[PDB]
RNA sequence: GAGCUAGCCCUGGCCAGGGUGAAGCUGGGGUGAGACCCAGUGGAGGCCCGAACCGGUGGGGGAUGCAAACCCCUCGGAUGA
RNA sequence: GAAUGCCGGCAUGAGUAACGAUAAAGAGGGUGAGAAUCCCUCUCGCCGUAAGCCCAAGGGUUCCUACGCAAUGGUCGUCAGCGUAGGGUUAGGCGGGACCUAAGGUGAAGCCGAAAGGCGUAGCCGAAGGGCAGCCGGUUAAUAUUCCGGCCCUUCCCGCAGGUGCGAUGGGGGGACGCUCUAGGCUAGGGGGACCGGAGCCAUGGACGAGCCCGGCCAGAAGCGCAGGGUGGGAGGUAGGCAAAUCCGCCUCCCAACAAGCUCUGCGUGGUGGGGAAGCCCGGGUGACAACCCCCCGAAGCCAGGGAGCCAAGAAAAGCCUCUAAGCACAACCUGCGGGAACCCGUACCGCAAACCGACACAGGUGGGCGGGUGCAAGAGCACUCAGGCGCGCGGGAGAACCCUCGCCAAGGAACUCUGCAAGUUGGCCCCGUAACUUCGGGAGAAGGGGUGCUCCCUGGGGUGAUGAGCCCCGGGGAGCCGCAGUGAACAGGCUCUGGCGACUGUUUACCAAAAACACAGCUCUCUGCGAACUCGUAAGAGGAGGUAUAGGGAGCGACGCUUGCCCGGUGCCGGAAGGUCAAGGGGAGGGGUGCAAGCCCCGAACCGAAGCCCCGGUGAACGGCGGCCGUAACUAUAACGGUCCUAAGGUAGCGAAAUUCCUUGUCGGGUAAGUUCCGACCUGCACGAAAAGCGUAACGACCGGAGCGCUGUCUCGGCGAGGGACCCGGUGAAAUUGAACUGGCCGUGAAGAUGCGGCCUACCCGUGGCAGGACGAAAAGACCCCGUGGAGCUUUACUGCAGCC
RNA sequence: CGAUGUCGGCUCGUCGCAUCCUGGGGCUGAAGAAGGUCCCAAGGGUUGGGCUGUUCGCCCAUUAAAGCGGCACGCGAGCUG
RNA sequence: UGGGAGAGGGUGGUGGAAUUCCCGGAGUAGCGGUGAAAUGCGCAGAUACCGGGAGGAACGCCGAUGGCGAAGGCAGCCACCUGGUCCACCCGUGACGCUGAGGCGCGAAAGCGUGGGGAGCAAACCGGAUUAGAUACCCGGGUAGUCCACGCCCUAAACG
RNA sequence: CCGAGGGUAGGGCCCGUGACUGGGGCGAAGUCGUAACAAGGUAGCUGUACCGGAAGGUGCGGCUGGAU
């Protein structure tokens, strides 16, 4: 659920905040945080390479365990559910009976004080991680690796999941969050359940001030600029686009497909996205 | 009103100084040039 | 050449005083249970008034200037992008 | 002899403007060749959240003293930030380094680039962040947390004593963190005292008095006290913290837990060391054996790493503690104590400024800390005033016009004008009261009105004490008094109705535009399956992102409400293994040159051979587009209806003389005595229209219209007054401009607007204050316009290339 | 074109006369009073407001009358903008 | 107290037929549609047939004139949670009852808001025919919607 | 002191009136089509929604007060 405000300022009329209800711990594990090096969009040359970034709240990066096959068979207790400013989903602190402490992204329905575990043998329960060839067809999954032992890459954002669809040889067929049908190697790991905090999408930032808190500087339309700046620049008065809608770099930006056609993964992608 | 020259000894030494020029091809040419011309000071005087 | 200016990054600092009184919390009323209503508490907000600080609205002066952008009066923001 | 030539020199303007804040001066006494200007005294004014003090930058001797006055100083100068000389800056504890890391920079390994060079995990460098041991007083012409005095402390080395498995660049803990609000107790700071100390005063009508005036503290080891911060203890198990581990983590059992204890800082106290006023006698002496006590106020500072709430979720590394590993366990480490040792650089002075940035001793700009008192509701606001600092480095007169800034005004009251521009009015606080409309918050300080000083009397609660007195805070009710007037000075909204545009707070053309422009939450399209797309780079490498489709890029639109119609023929984009066209290459029928030859060499057809284009289809919150004629109804008028040409299709809803309407001041209605503007309607809309969004919309606006009330020197229509200039005398003394000048009017003429030509008229010579009609006055080799086979920015289905992509 | 500042307004005027008013006249389809039309005449006079940047013009209330033109569409080293 | 029947309601699971799309096979000259046609689809390989896969909605026979509920209304099968109602015994209470202005709750469809889903169907819309014309009835397409959740709307030939 | 009332300011209700605009009633001697009554030539009616010169059409669900 999401929290509304009484309209006691013009911005509070629409602003909505996450209820933060599943949160049980307001501080991060000191051993699992390291400083997030803010870029502002600048690359190693000092040049802006992603526009309109910077000036958001300071953040510490919480180290996330995107492998899990690290610790096959060693169960852990869900010790807490925490806020992570570096991503949309929440994070759960796991205390491994090993004594080690690790963060995973919190699935939907994870309950503090529950057991989870990883391996070929794990039961098919929310929070457990297994290679795909041992998750039953139809079960919804998240934190899916793309290649064996290279780390979880798909279905990591709030509310998202991927669905096992069927086995073919060494591979499984998934429906990714985007509706894409893709093969993924069966030995790739994955974690049963969907990612939590599904109400993330219903947040209403409410004011220009909020975007700024997030490191998002104001976006300025090409239609607002001059010919030296943008294809849509200039015109006396307001002007329609007067050419096919283009990016600041000239390429067209309504419909032009941009994936590389000769990419080797085309062999593994079965059906392009829906919607 | 706030003007253009805002003296600052660290900034001065670190931008125009001897070790700054010596680290780049352009900087050494400045020194080769200013030595060939006979300048009394190859580099701005910074109090340090 | 970014010791002016623009943006970002790292690390510090500053914002008198007053006003408004959101959620929540307690009590009470209410109901089968509730929604909800009243009171107290509470102290929210690109909230209000106004110095510092940041601006530069309108008029006047200045115009070989005090000044190659200043001066006076008035005026905007002032916990926030 | 001319190049608005170049360099230099000297004129003109001219004894003219000006001498840099309108905070302000007067006299006496010294010094001296010389005095408005230097020094000293008295009087006066100005600052006092500074115009006082401290600190960091920056400046670099400007500091102090003697001696000077040519120049510098907007005058003067005997003075000085000026000339000459001499002197002056003292640290284990203050700041930086012999410590740590942040962005960033550099860079073993490694990667990349024609060269030069670009990157790059480790490491190193890098501070105003972390860390770390000094406080009070005195002293010099000039330095002081540095010298000295008193009282504390830190590290290193060596030695002694006790103690312990000692030992690290390695493991762990800690260091270690946001914003807003805030409790308790303290301190800084302050106010009062009828109490303590004090040189003296009694004026001019009264007063020898709870009289006046002055002051009544500072630092301090251990110990103790008060208030706080931090931390559970034991046992056992252990596969994790890239070795080890007794440490840390994880499980379990026992006891203790909001306590206590252990540890840590604050504050008080404290042996001891200091300070010590007014007044008056030449910075010094005395006051004085100074007193050094009580009550109230009270932090934003301290205890601190406190507490609570919230979402935007808030550095690192070392010092420190613990663990062990090699090793070493006659060593080593810890604890106490003692002796020794303790380096380098800075330290003067200015520092909101005459010493810094602005060419100047320049009304400008410059980061942090202290910033007293009284009154006004509060305050860093305002007035005055302490301490402290100033009167702004030209003066003296005069009392015109004119200018600036300021004050008032009879009757009228926006008649002013493009516009109430400007200036009035209003103005704080307390109480009463408050409309349409609304997104239910608002609109709202709406509007409008009442109160406001002082005296006496009764009285309610709170803070501190003790429950009381005293002090201080917040009230209440009566009865009176004065004046033109009680926020009696200063600081402090004019209000309303209605329309346009933009939802809103924000942002902008530094230095002519602050807006209706940009941004903005939000809406939609669209790309991207992760070595993502996209962006920077030749590349390596980076960003995106230590993110993963609830994500990231691109584009338009711009809160919210109700909505967003038709056209896919052209262009774009997407889909389409057919067909058509298609490059190198493949293929080699056939043809040629040459040789006696085998052979060498050259041309060359069908056929095979990609993307692209052509072809088929899809697609509008993709580029874009959205008709013309004739006829017809009980009068006319008009046409629901029929017809016809054209188109890819002919503009829907809603709005419309509009930020769009040419004709136009359309017509009608409203307001007005009168309304090219304004509002409300109509609709033949020159030339609206639905995300270059359409129509509305509460709130908001230094936006731009229109109207009214209040009030006014805006005006009728002007007057007077004030100060600073203008004027006169003394001092200093520019500027642009200038062919030379002995430089009048008219009517003519002249390259067509003549002081300079003709004719006539008028006119003794030379200045000072004023005014601006002329000298086609000055300034700038016209920005407009054109010309030049001049330039540069921008665009595209101009040409031709290139990167990029296929 | 090595610059002759451009609309309107305000201020200050001055001039022409083809005269708006006032003075003097002739003719009248001039009874009177009021007009019409032409002649003489430039001495003086020629209002205040609403609208619009406006010139001009309409409109309101008056008036003896609310004249038309020139002076670089008079006047920006006089102001406005 | 002991029993009964039932598509009453709520939640969560899962079963099969069929439609559509996509993949492979095979095959060729039309299919589809109507009163008759045409648009449309089809040699770029359709329809018909075989296998594989995805997805949504609705549940054939049982099913009846039946059953249930206050009404709206409820229909595959399984479980959980839960409502009303009938019978038999005649055990308990002792008129505790009937109605019901206001109030409160429920309330088909369509419609609304936020999100999701989207096979079939189908307002609007586009084309074909029919027709004197045909903004209709018929045909080929097609967006909301129809479905899920939560919140509204409160209507009806909500009828016996 | 109270006080008729007068003055300022802001509200509530009602009546008359208004450029223009919305439908309604009546008039009929017009134009257009033919929606309903027969199976009214697409059975009708219905709530709602979208649409069309007009009556009206269609979708969704409902009623029979529908001929065969
Ligand atoms: Mg939740
Ligand atoms: Mg809200
Ligand atoms: Mg709220
Ligand atoms: Mg709310
Ligand atoms: Mg709002
Ligand atoms: Mg919340
Ligand atoms: Mg949560
Ligand atoms: Mg760390
Ligand atoms: Mg990181
Ligand atoms: Mg990075
Ligand atoms: Mg770098
Ligand atoms: Mg570089
Ligand atoms: Mg940059
Ligand atoms: Mg970018
Ligand atoms: Mg950026
Ligand atoms: Mg951020
Ligand atoms: Mg989160
Ligand atoms: Mg969220
Ligand atoms: Mg949103
Ligand atoms: Mg955005
Ligand atoms: Mg934008
Ligand atoms: Mg622009
Ligand atoms: Mg550029
Ligand atoms: Mg270009
Ligand atoms: Mg371009
Ligand atoms: Mg353009
Ligand atoms: Mg244009
Ligand atoms: Mg433009
Ligand atoms: Mg235009
Ligand atoms: Mg523009
Ligand atoms: Mg534009
Ligand atoms: Mg615009
Ligand atoms: Mg254009
Ligand atoms: Mg366009
Ligand atoms: Mg175009
Ligand atoms: Mg792949
Ligand atoms: Mg600076
Ligand atoms: Mg300097
Ligand atoms: Mg420096
Ligand atoms: Mg620097
Ligand atoms: Mg250097
Ligand atoms: Mg030199
Ligand atoms: Mg030399
Ligand atoms: Mg140099
Ligand atoms: Mg910081
Ligand atoms: Mg502030
Ligand atoms: Mg309150
Ligand atoms: Mg609370
Ligand atoms: Mg504010
Ligand atoms: Mg405010
Ligand atoms: Mg400024
Ligand atoms: Mg200004
Ligand atoms: Mg003004
Ligand atoms: Mg003025
Ligand atoms: Mg001026
Ligand atoms: Mg100027
Ligand atoms: Mg000023
Ligand atoms: Mg000022
Ligand atoms: Mg002001
Ligand atoms: Mg303010
Ligand atoms: Mg404030
Ligand atoms: Mg505020
Ligand atoms: Mg603000
Ligand atoms: Mg010559
Ligand atoms: Mg010259
Ligand atoms: Mg010259
Ligand atoms: Mg010359
Ligand atoms: Mg010269
Ligand atoms: Mg001469
Ligand atoms: Mg002169
Ligand atoms: Mg001067
Ligand atoms: Mg001057
Ligand atoms: Mg003054
Ligand atoms: Mg004077
Ligand atoms: Mg003198
Ligand atoms: Mg003298
Ligand atoms: Mg003196
Ligand atoms: Mg003061
Ligand atoms: Mg200097
Ligand atoms: Mg000194
Ligand atoms: Mg000196
Ligand atoms: Mg001198
Ligand atoms: Mg001299
Ligand atoms: Mg001399
Ligand atoms: Mg001088
Ligand atoms: Mg000077
Ligand atoms: Mg002398
Ligand atoms: Mg001096
Ligand atoms: Mg000396
Ligand atoms: Mg010392
Ligand atoms: Mg050393
Ligand atoms: Mg280091
Ligand atoms: Mg440091
Ligand atoms: Mg000294
Ligand atoms: Mg000490
Ligand atoms: Mg020990
Ligand atoms: Mg040890
Ligand atoms: Mg260690
Ligand atoms: Mg941390
Ligand atoms: Mg920090
Ligand atoms: Mg804040
Ligand atoms: Mg006080
Ligand atoms: Mg205490
Ligand atoms: Mg172990
Ligand atoms: Mg003394
Ligand atoms: Mg003595
Ligand atoms: Mg004594
Ligand atoms: Mg404060
Ligand atoms: Mg805390
Ligand atoms: Mg959040
Ligand atoms: Mg934190
Ligand atoms: Mg770090
Ligand atoms: Mg050993
Ligand atoms: Mg050394
Ligand atoms: Mg030294
Ligand atoms: Mg010193
Ligand atoms: Mg000074
Ligand atoms: Mg200043
Ligand atoms: Mg300062
Ligand atoms: Mg100087
Ligand atoms: Mg200057
Ligand atoms: Mg200069
Ligand atoms: Mg001076
Ligand atoms: Mg100055
Ligand atoms: Mg003080
Ligand atoms: Mg006051
Ligand atoms: Mg006050
Ligand atoms: Mg103030
Ligand atoms: Mg005082
Ligand atoms: Mg003075
Ligand atoms: Mg002066
Ligand atoms: Mg005079
Ligand atoms: Mg008057
Ligand atoms: Mg008036
Ligand atoms: Mg009046
Ligand atoms: Mg006005
Ligand atoms: Mg006033
Ligand atoms: Mg006032
Ligand atoms: Mg009203
Ligand atoms: Mg008021
Ligand atoms: Mg208002
Ligand atoms: Mg009095
Ligand atoms: Mg007074
Ligand atoms: Mg004053
Ligand atoms: Mg005010
Ligand atoms: Mg209004
Ligand atoms: Mg608008
Ligand atoms: Mg705007
Ligand atoms: Mg705005
Ligand atoms: Mg709006
Ligand atoms: Mg805005
Ligand atoms: Mg603001
Ligand atoms: Mg802008
Ligand atoms: Mg500009
Ligand atoms: Mg500007
Ligand atoms: Mg400029
Ligand atoms: Mg400029
Ligand atoms: Mg501007
Ligand atoms: Mg503005
Ligand atoms: Mg904008
Ligand atoms: Mg929108
Ligand atoms: Mg590039
Ligand atoms: Mg890279
Ligand atoms: Mg990256
Ligand atoms: Mg990265
Ligand atoms: Mg990402
Ligand atoms: Mg907006
Ligand atoms: Mg915008
Ligand atoms: Mg509305
Ligand atoms: Mg149409
Ligand atoms: Mg098209
Ligand atoms: Mg097309
Ligand atoms: Mg085109
Ligand atoms: Mg082909
Ligand atoms: Mg051959
Ligand atoms: Mg659309
Ligand atoms: Mg077109
Ligand atoms: Mg378009
Ligand atoms: Mg049109
Ligand atoms: Mg119109
Ligand atoms: Mg309009
Ligand atoms: Mg138009
Ligand atoms: Mg026109
Ligand atoms: Mg017009
Ligand atoms: Mg016009
Ligand atoms: Mg008109
Ligand atoms: Mg009227
Ligand atoms: Mg107007
Ligand atoms: Mg018309
Ligand atoms: Mg338009
Ligand atoms: Mg546009
Ligand atoms: Mg527009
Ligand atoms: Mg509001
Ligand atoms: Mg505004
Ligand atoms: Mg504005
Ligand atoms: Mg006047
Ligand atoms: Mg006077
Ligand atoms: Mg005067
Ligand atoms: Mg005077
Ligand atoms: Mg005067
Ligand atoms: Mg001569
Ligand atoms: Mg001439
Ligand atoms: Mg002439
Ligand atoms: Mg003459
Ligand atoms: Mg001559
Ligand atoms: Mg002659
Ligand atoms: Mg002559
Ligand atoms: Mg004459
Ligand atoms: Mg003149
Ligand atoms: Mg003059
Ligand atoms: Mg002239
Ligand atoms: Mg002349
Ligand atoms: Mg002239
Ligand atoms: Mg002239
Ligand atoms: Mg000039
Ligand atoms: Mg030239
Ligand atoms: Mg020229
Ligand atoms: Mg020219
Ligand atoms: Mg020029
Ligand atoms: Mg021309
Ligand atoms: Mg040519
Ligand atoms: Mg030529
Ligand atoms: Mg060019
Ligand atoms: Mg590309
Ligand atoms: Mg010219
Ligand atoms: Mg010239
Ligand atoms: Mg000129
Ligand atoms: Mg008669
Ligand atoms: Mg005659
Ligand atoms: Mg006359
Ligand atoms: Mg005359
Ligand atoms: Mg006019
Ligand atoms: Mg004219
Ligand atoms: Mg006109
Ligand atoms: Mg007219
Ligand atoms: Mg009359
Ligand atoms: Mg008359
Ligand atoms: Mg004229
Ligand atoms: Mg003319
Ligand atoms: Mg003309
Ligand atoms: Mg003229
Ligand atoms: Mg003129
Ligand atoms: Mg002018
Ligand atoms: Mg003019
Ligand atoms: Mg003149
Ligand atoms: Mg004007
Ligand atoms: Mg203008
Ligand atoms: Mg049946
Ligand atoms: Mg019985
Ligand atoms: Mg009822
Ligand atoms: Mg319903
Ligand atoms: Mg429904
Ligand atoms: Mg609906
Ligand atoms: Mg579908
Ligand atoms: Mg027809
Ligand atoms: Mg629709
Ligand atoms: Mg919809
Ligand atoms: Mg029935
Ligand atoms: Mg009366
Ligand atoms: Mg019919
Ligand atoms: Mg029918
Ligand atoms: Mg029908
Ligand atoms: Mg029609
Ligand atoms: Mg239809
Ligand atoms: Mg029914």
Swiss-Prot record, chain A:
Q: Where is the composition biased (Basic residues)?
A: 256-275
Q: What is this protein called?
A: Large ribosomal subunit protein uL2
What is the taxonomic lineage of the source species? Answer: Bacteria, Thermotogati, Deinococcota, Deinococci, Thermales
Q: Read off the PROSITE patterns from this record.
A: RIBOSOMAL_L2
Q: Which GO terms describe its molecular function?
A: rRNA binding; structural constituent of ribosome; transferase activity
Instruction: Please explain the role this protein plays, according to its UniProt record.
Output: One of the primary rRNA binding proteins. Required for association of the 30S and 50S subunits to form the 70S ribosome, for tRNA binding and peptide bond formation. It has been suggested to have peptidyltransferase activity; this is somewhat controversial. Makes several contacts with the 16S rRNA (forming bridge B7b) in the 70S ribosome.
For this UniProt entry, what's an example GO CC term? large ribosomal subunit
Chain spans, region Disordered = 222-275
Origin organism is Thermus thermophilus (strain ATCC 27634 / DSM 579 / HB8)
Q: Which Pfam families match?
A: Ribosomal_L2, Ribosomal_L2_C
From Swiss-Prot, chain B:
Other observations noted: The open reading frame (ORF) for this protein is entirely within the ORF for the RNase P protein (RnaP). The two start codons are separated by four nucleotides.
Cellular component, GO annotation: ribonucleoprotein complex; ribosome
Give any Pfam family that matches.
Ribosomal_L34
Q: Does the keyword Ribosomal protein apply?
A: yes
Has the keyword ATP-binding been applied to this entry?
no
Q: Where is the composition biased (Basic residues)?
A: 29-48
The job of this chain, per UniProt, is described as: Found on the solvent side of the large subunit.
Q: Which PANTHER family match?
A: LARGE RIBOSOMAL SUBUNIT PROTEIN BL34M, MITOCHONDRIAL RIBOSOMAL PROTEIN 34 FAMILY MEMBER
Q: Which UniProt keywords apply?
A: Ribonucleoprotein, Ribosomal protein
Q: Which Gene3D superfamilies match?
A: 1.10.287.3980
Question: What GO terms are given for molecular function?
Answer: structural constituent of ribosome
Q: What protein am I looking at?
A: Large ribosomal subunit protein bL34
**Region (Disordered): which ranges?**
26-48
Query: GO biological process annotations for this chain's record?
Result: translation
Subunit description: Part of the 50S ribosomal subunit.
Q: What family does this chain come from, according to its entry?
A: Belongs to the bacterial ribosomal protein bL34 family.
């Amino acid at each position: 659920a999401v929290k509304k405000f009484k309209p006691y300022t013009p911005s509070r009329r629409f602003m909505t905040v996450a209820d933060f209800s599943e949160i049980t711990k307001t501080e991060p594990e000191k051993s699992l945080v390291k400083p997030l090096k803010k870029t502002g969009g600048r690359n190693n040359q000092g040049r802006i390479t992603v526009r309109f970034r910077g000036g958001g709240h300071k953040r510490l990066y919480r180290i996330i365990d995107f492998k899990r096959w690290d610790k096959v068979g060693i169960p852990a207790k869900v010790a807490a559910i925490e806020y992570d400013p570096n991503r949309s989903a929440r994070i759960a602190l796991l205390h491994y009976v090993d004594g080690e402490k690790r963060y995973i992204i919190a699935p939907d329905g994870l309950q503090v004080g529950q057991q989870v575990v990883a391996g070929p043998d794990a039961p098919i329960q929310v929070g457990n991680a297994l290679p795909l060839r041992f998750i039953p067809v139809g079960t919804v999954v998240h934190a899916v690796e793309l290649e064996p032992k290279k780390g979880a890459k798909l279905a990591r954002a709030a509310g998202t999941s991927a669905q096992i669809q069927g086995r073919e040889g060494d591979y499984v067929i998934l429906r990714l969050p985007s509706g894409e049908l893709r093969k993924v190697h069966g030995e790739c790991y994955a974690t049963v359940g969907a990612v939590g905090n599904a109400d993330h999408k219903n947040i209403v930032l409410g004011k220009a001030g909020r975007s700024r808190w997030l490191g998002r500087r104001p976006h300025v339309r090409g239609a607002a600029m001059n010919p030296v700046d943008h294809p849509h620049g200039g015109g006396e008065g307001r002007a329609p686009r007067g050419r096919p809608p283009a990016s600041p770099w000239g390429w067209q930006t309504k419909g032009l497909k941009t994936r590389k056609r000769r990419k080797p993964s085309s062999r593994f992608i079965i059906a392009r996205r829906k919607k | 009103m706030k003007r253009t020259w805002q003296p600052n000894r660290r900034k001065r030494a670190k931008t125009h100084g001897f070790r700054a020029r010596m680290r780049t091809p352009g900087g050494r040419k400045v020194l080769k040039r200013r030595r060939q011309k006979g300048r009394w000071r190859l580099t701005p005087a910074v109090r340090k």
